[PDB]
């Protein structure tokens, strides 16, 4: 079995490990992925936090806070920032090669960041169903990547991510009326074909 790969294509979409594009415009802070899931120690707790990103625009600067080995290293606005160095500095590593910030954290973990929005965490063979969050469980089964925090499969992913937010008193996002044209392209058929 090969190394899976999340992604955050554009402002509001998510690609799971097993491979499942789905839509989730949120504005609160959300659990991209973690290990503390049911009956396990809880080693790493990668998070993601967006601001003004329910409608994609030149706005929506992300904030990423990753919690491993009792550490707190986070990044936004181009650079990375350490708030609490972790104990085992040996596995730590940062490679600012090209557009990206490649970022190792251990034998079986890695992260990538295009300095603008993309978040592509990369895992190894080690876990094989030890995680949960937005990216799902990493089991090979692709339809069980909507297993909400309350341990059931949903069908409408807008209700999925609302379970995984951190601040349980901030805003749950609104079920949008589905349509093939977003806000501007809605009733502007001309512009739709120049983008198409």
């Amino acid at each position: 079995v090969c190394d899976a790969t999340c992604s955050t294509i554009g402002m509001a979409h998510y690609l799971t490990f097993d491979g499942l594009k789905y839509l989730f415009p949120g504005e609160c802070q959300y659990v991209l992925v973690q290990d503390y899931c049911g009956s396990n120690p809880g080693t790493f707790r990668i998070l993601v936090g967006n601001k003004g990103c329910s409608h994609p625009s030149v706005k929506c600067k992300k904030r990423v806070t990753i919690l491993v080995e009792g550490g707190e290293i986070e990044l936004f606005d181009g650079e990375v920032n350490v708030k609490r160095p972790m104990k085992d500095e040996t596995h730590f590593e940062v490679v600012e090669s090209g557009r990206y910030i490649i970022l190792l954290l251990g034998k079986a973990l890695s992260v990538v960041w295009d300095r603008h929005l993309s978040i592509s965490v990369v895992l190894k063979q080690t876990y094989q169903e030890k995680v949960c969050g937005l990216c799902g469980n990493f089991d090979g089964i692709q339809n069980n990547d909507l297993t909400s925090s309350n341990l059931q499969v949903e069908e409408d992913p807008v209700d999925f991510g609302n379970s995984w937010k951190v601040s349980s008193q901030c805003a749950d996002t609104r079920k949008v009326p589905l349509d093939s044209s977003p806000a501007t392209c809605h009733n502007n058929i001309m512009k739709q074909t120049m983008v198409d």
């Binding site: 659990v31 503390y36 707790r45 998070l47 806070t65 919690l67 009792g70 707190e72 909400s148 925090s149 309350n150 059931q152 949903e154 379970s163 995984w164 951190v166 601040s167 349980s168 008193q169």
Partner: protein, 83 residues
């Protein structure tokens, strides 16, 4: 006001409302604590820690148990689920 003004300056005060015979209004289930954490551990919550290193803030909050669920305090045993 004088309580908060001194609190903001880096020097908090405690329990002053015990004998003052005036507590600020709050809805049912809660009354005015002093220096409660903003990250109130509620019912439908993920058990995560040492991210909420924010400063300590005044305001009314639930009893020791009695977790929050939709604007009221409710006992930890009766935590619902959602679908």
């Amino acid at each position: 006001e004088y309580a908060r003004t001194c609190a903001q300056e880096g020097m908090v005060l405690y329990g002053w409302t015990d004998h003052s015979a005036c507590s600020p209004v709050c809805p049912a289930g809660m009354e005015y604590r002093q220096c409660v954490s903003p990250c109130a551990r509620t019912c439908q919550s993920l058990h995560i820690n040492e991210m909420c290193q924010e400063r300590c803030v005044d305001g009314c909050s639930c009893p020791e148990g009695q977790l929050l669920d939709e604007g009221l305090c409710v006992e930890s045993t009766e935590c619902p689920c959602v679908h």
